[PDB]
Design an enzyme around this catalytic site. Structure first.
Site, PDB file in Angstrom:
ATOM      1  N   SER A   1      41.863  42.826  24.159  1.00 31.87           N
ATOM      2  CA  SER A   1      42.661  44.027  24.353  1.00 31.87           C
ATOM      3  C   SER A   1      42.064  45.122  23.468  1.00 31.87           C
ATOM      4  O   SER A   1      40.850  45.362  23.537  1.00 31.87           O
ATOM      5  CB  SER A   1      44.122  43.686  24.087  1.00 31.87           C
ATOM      6  OG  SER A   1      44.948  44.834  24.053  1.00 31.87           O
TER       7      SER A   1
ATOM      8  N   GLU B   1      43.865  47.368  37.990  1.00 26.73           N
ATOM      9  CA  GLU B   1      42.773  46.428  38.220  1.00 26.73           C
ATOM     10  C   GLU B   1      41.532  47.143  38.740  1.00 26.73           C
ATOM     11  O   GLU B   1      40.415  46.872  38.290  1.00 26.73           O
ATOM     12  CB  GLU B   1      43.218  45.338  39.196  1.00 26.73           C
ATOM     13  CG  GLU B   1      42.456  44.027  39.074  1.00 26.73           C
ATOM     14  CD  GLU B   1      41.650  43.707  40.322  1.00 26.73           C
ATOM     15  OE1 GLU B   1      41.330  44.647  41.086  1.00 26.73           O
ATOM     16  OE2 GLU B   1      41.337  42.514  40.544  1.00 26.73           O
TER      17      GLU B   1
ATOM     18  N   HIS C   1      44.926  38.513  32.201  1.00 26.01           N
ATOM     19  CA  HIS C   1      44.963  39.248  30.938  1.00 26.01           C
ATOM     20  C   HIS C   1      45.977  38.577  30.014  1.00 26.01           C
ATOM     21  O   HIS C   1      47.091  39.055  29.797  1.00 26.01           O
ATOM     22  CB  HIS C   1      45.323  40.708  31.177  1.00 26.01           C
ATOM     23  CG  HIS C   1      44.294  41.484  31.938  1.00 26.01           C
ATOM     24  ND1 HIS C   1      44.258  41.525  33.315  1.00 26.01           N
ATOM     25  CD2 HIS C   1      43.296  42.294  31.512  1.00 26.01           C
ATOM     26  CE1 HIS C   1      43.266  42.306  33.705  1.00 26.01           C
ATOM     27  NE2 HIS C   1      42.667  42.785  32.629  1.00 26.01           N
TER      28      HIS C   1
END
Length: 266
Positions: free
Chosen positions: A120, A212, A244
Site C-alpha cells: 500500500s 482496478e 489487495h
C-alpha cells in the site's frame, strides 16, 4: 533465529522513540514496512501474517517498524496541518540513518545489503528507498503500491486516502502536486535510478472497477517503462485472482523469500 523482540529506538529527528519489532537471524535484514493505516501498537505484518515465523532460520533478520499512519515513510515538509500533529514526520531519516545506526551498534545488523518490502502506501516507499539508497537496499518490493503518485488521478486519491486514514494532509507531506517533492518520490519517475543501480525489484498487484483500471494502466506502464529503460532485474506479478489484502501480500512475501535469500546472501 531469535525470539521476537520489541525495541524502543530513539529518533532525534522526530523527537521521540519509535517502537520496532525485531527478529535476529543474520547480519542482513528484511525491512517490513506497513500500510496506510499503520497502528501504534504493532506492525501490520505482525498483526496479520506469520511473516516472522516464515523468515525464521532464513539467514535474514526481520525489522518491523511501528507507527507512521499515512506517513508514506517519508520526510514531511511540516506537521500535518489538519489533525493536530505536534511534530514533523521524518521516517526516511529514521529508516536510512537512525534505525540502521542503532541496529549496527547494538546488534551487529549491517546497514547495507538489506531488502525493503512495502505494501500500500509503503510499496512505492520501498522502491524510492532503493532508488536513493542502493547500498542499504539492493532489494525492494512493492505490494499493491502507488507506483506513480505524482501523476493524474493519484495525488487526489492519495490525499483522499490520507484524509480517511487519520485525517492527514498530503499537502503537509509533499506540498501541492506541482511541488517537485511529488516527482522525487514517484517510483515511475525514478525508474532510471532503479535501472542504473541494478536494483532487484519485486512488484505485485492484483468505485472499484475504475480503480482496478487505474492500477492496471499504472502498473503495466511501470513494467513497460522499466523494460524500455533497460531494466533486467525485476519480477512483475499481476495474477488476475490476486487481491489487495494481507493473505496475498503474505503469499508474495513467501514467494520472494528464496529470491531475497539469493540476492542478499549470495
Amino acid at each position: 533465529g531469535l525470539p521476537v523482540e520489541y525495541l524502543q529506538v530513539p529518533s532525534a529527528s522526530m523527537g521521540r522513540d519509535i517502537k520496532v519489532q525485531f527478529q535476529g537471524g543474520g547480519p542482513h535484514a528484511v525491512y517490513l514496512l506497513d500500510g496506510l493505516r499503520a497502528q501504534d501498537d504493532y506492525n501490520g505484518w505482525d498483526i496479520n501474517t506469520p511473516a516472522f515465523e516464515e523468515y525464521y532460520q532464513s539467514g535474514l533478520s526481520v525489522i518491523m517498524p511501528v507507527g507512521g499512519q499515512s506517513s508514506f515513510y517519508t520526510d514531511w515538509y511540516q506537521p500535518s496541518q489538519s489533525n493536530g500533529q505536534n511534530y514533523t514526520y521524518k521516517w526516511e531519516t529514521f529508516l536510512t540513518r537512525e534505525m540502521p545506526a542503532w541496529l549496527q551498534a547494538n546488534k551487529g545488523v549491517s546497514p547495507t545489503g538489506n531488502a525493503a518490502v512495502g505494501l500500500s502506501m509503503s510499496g512505492g516507499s520501498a522502491l524510492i528507498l532503493a532508488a536513493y539508497y542502493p547500498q542499504q537496499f539492493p532489494y525492494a518490493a512493492s505490494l499493491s503500491g502507488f507506483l506513480n503518485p505524482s501523476e493524474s488521478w493519484w495525488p487526489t486519491l492519495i490525499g483522499l486516502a490520507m484524509n480517511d486514514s487519520g485525517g492527514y494532509n498530503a499537502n503537509s507531506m509533499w506540498g501541492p502536486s506541482s511541488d517537485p517533492a511529488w516527482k522525487r518520490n514517484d517510483p515511475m519517475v525514478q525508474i532510471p535510478r532503479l535501472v542504473a543501480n541494478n536494483t532487484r525489484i519485486w512488484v505485485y498487484c492484483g468505485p472499484a472497477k475504475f480503480l482496478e483500471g487505474l492500477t492496471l494502466r499504472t502498473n503495466q506502464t511501470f513494467r513497460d517503462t522499466y523494460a524500455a529503460d533497460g531494466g533486467r532485474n525485476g519480477v512483475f506479478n499481476f495474477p488476475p485472482n490476486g487481491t489487495h489484502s494481507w493473505p496475498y501480500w503474505n503469499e508474495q512475501l513467501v514467494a520472494m523469500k528464496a529470491d531475497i535469500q539469493h540476492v542478499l546472501n549470495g
